[PDB]
C-alpha cells in the first residue's frame, strides 16, 4: 500500500465542515465551563473570607 493512500476517516468526520459554524460551537462549550467555574470560585473565596468576620456572639455585644 502506497503512503499516498490515506485511510478511511468517513465514520468520524463531519459531513459539513464549516470553519465559522464549527468554531462557535466549540467555544460556546468552553465558555459555559468558564462561566460556571468563575461563579464557583467566587463562592469559594467568599466562604473563607467571611469566616474571618465578626462571629454571632461578638455581634451581640455591639
Amino acid at each position: 500500500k502506497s503512503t499516498y493512500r490515506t485511510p478511511n476517516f468517513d465514520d468520524v468526520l463531519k459531513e459539513n465542515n464549516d470553519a465559522d459554524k464549527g468554531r462557535s460551537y466549540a467555544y460556546f462549550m468552553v465558555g459555559a465551563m468558564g462561566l460556571l467555574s468563575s461563579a464557583g470560585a467566587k463562592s469559594t473565596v467568599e466562604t473563607f473570607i467571611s469566616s474571618m468576620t465578626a462571629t454571632a456572639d461578638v455581634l451581640a455585644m455591639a
Binding site: 454571632a56 456572639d57 451581640a60 455585644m61
Partner: protein
C-alpha cells in the same frame, strides 16, 4: 436566647422569657456581688448549680 428569635418566637417574646431569670452582674462600687435580669446574649440556665 438570641437564637430563638425568628425561628420559633418573636424578639419581643424572647426578651420576656429571659427576664424571668437572674444572672450574676458586675460588682458595685463597694465590691459586693450583684444580680440582674437576663438579656438576649445570655444562655438558657439549668436547674442545678
Amino acid at each position: 436566647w438570641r437564637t430563638l428569635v425568628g425561628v420559633s418566637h418573636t424578639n419581643e417574646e424572647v426578651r420576656n422569657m429571659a427576664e424571668e431569670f437572674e444572672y450574676d452582674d458586675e460588682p458595685d462600687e463597694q465590691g459586693n456581688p450583684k444580680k440582674r435580669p437576663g438579656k438576649l446574649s445570655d444562655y438558657i440556665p439549668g436547674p442545678y448549680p
